[PDB]
Amino acid sequence: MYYGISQFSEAYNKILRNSSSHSSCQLVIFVSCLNIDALCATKMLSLLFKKQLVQSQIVPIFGYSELRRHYSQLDDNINSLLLVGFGGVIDLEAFLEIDPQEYVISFRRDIYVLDAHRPWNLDNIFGSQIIQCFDDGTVDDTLGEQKEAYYKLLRKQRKKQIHEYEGVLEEYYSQGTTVVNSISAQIYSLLSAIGETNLSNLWLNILGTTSLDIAYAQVYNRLYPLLQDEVKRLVKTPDTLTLNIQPDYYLFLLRHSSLYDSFYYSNYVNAKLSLWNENGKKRLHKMFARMGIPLSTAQETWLYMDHSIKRELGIIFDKNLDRYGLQDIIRDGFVRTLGYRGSISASEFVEALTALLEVGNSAQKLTNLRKRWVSNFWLSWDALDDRKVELLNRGIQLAQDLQRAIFNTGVAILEKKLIKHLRIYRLCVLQDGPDLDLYRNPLTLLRLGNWLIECCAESEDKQLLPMVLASIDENTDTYLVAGLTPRYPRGLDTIHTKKPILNNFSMAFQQITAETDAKVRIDNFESSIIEIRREDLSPFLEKLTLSGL
């Protein structure tokens, strides 16, 4: 590894040696927009660097083109640069044409890449001293064999060694893009090693680690015990700030919407009981009756809903949910209370943040979209502090609205049966329908796809196939396409969890674009999302069908 976890603080010291000045902004940070873990890590870093009065600047970017342009905008006065949430799996030197001899003086301007994606560039690690990263603990063990060939390859019978090295490099490559650790986890580990831990840092660490529950439950289960132990290690006066381990359930805004709507919109219950047709609603009403809560009572706000059954809810769930088999809905989570203001939980808060990111407030229109994305990111950032709650109530209500719209579109999709089952991968295209303008956002599209893949998994089908989903915006006449991996049922044992399902869509897309002259634009930091032309879609799809996946 370059920087092991046992030396992070040293790198911190280096920053103080180079950037701590009086009247010179000598540190700029690039953040992977449209990501929650990056935002949490950036907030932690901003607080830390405000503590020691180190002047700094935060810059949000959306695509690699903006990265290149803003790097070209940089000046040599910047001794240290930060990149968080991206830039791990590509060689920046070949990307930003860094001349090692231009910067040697040492190499002057240091750049700190901090990301999590595991198929990250080997040359970008072992070949450059200008570029330097924070390994999570992957190189020391996993890459114990790949680095040997690179070191060797950086009288007619020696071609066997070259062939072996080439084969080793090829075997290392051609793997899916995955995430195995959280950025905020490493940031909090550095904070703990230094000695600057407090309740705000713990809250931000919890947010960062819990933003991955949707997609990386394995990572979440690996990381939970450390959070539990740390929160254990660390009269209701109006200044109480309590962090608790309270039971919580996989429910959409349980503490801000009625229990009926919570069950109705919860994705897990949807998948388990098929609430998009009539039998699902009948089974839901049967469940409510057998629990014994009136249908008029269960449709009241959580504040005013009856205190006795609020107390008895746990026992009611324990005694009733077994018949329908929904007992995997009960888990243990974190709750934050601030005096007399109320109560909130991590899941609700991250859903509010995600919705606020989604909704807030040819080339020209694309630039306008990419700039309003940054504006929404900054609004979400400002929403973090405890002095503002009117930027959180709005987020909660917008989350409700967005989930309703997603459910309304998904029921139509599953009713029309647009999901075409090919030989290898499923496909569905939203040619026409309602509210299509919302799905121009990659995160909204991912939310829709997550619900769809959950629904598909929660069936009797025994085939795990990648899914391809497309949209349309008539203004640009382009299709936005995202590739989605299959997911195991949540209530599954860990023995069949040797390796997470990888994602080869980025490799397939890049190979097809290299071999044919399609009119695509691959600039998202998420390499599994591309933009394509309406007339160019179908042959492209054919190619993807005929290519090796």
Binding site: T516, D517, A518, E535, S538, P539, F540, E542, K543
Partner: protein, 112 residues
Amino acid sequence: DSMLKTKQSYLKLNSVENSLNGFSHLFSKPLMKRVKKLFKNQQEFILDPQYEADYVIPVLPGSHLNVKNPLLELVKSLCHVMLLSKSTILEIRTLRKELLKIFELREFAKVA
């Protein structure tokens, strides 16, 4: 040739005129099969670089339409030339709808 043949047959027999009515029954199925084959080949080889020469839409003085798929204009012209009958409208319209069903389009669409 088909129109000549049907007019000759009608004359041999002896706003509608049976001189031409029923002439499209001669070449329907081969035309449909050929259109399907053309569509498949165009789908297969449209994005190839070395085959990009033969799909280039020529530019001429007075040209103002900007359109993408060549087979669409081929079939559109081949149908508009038949539609001039003014007496066999319905048969031509059925054939045109059947042709458009090969693509994922609709009978009264703007692009058609």
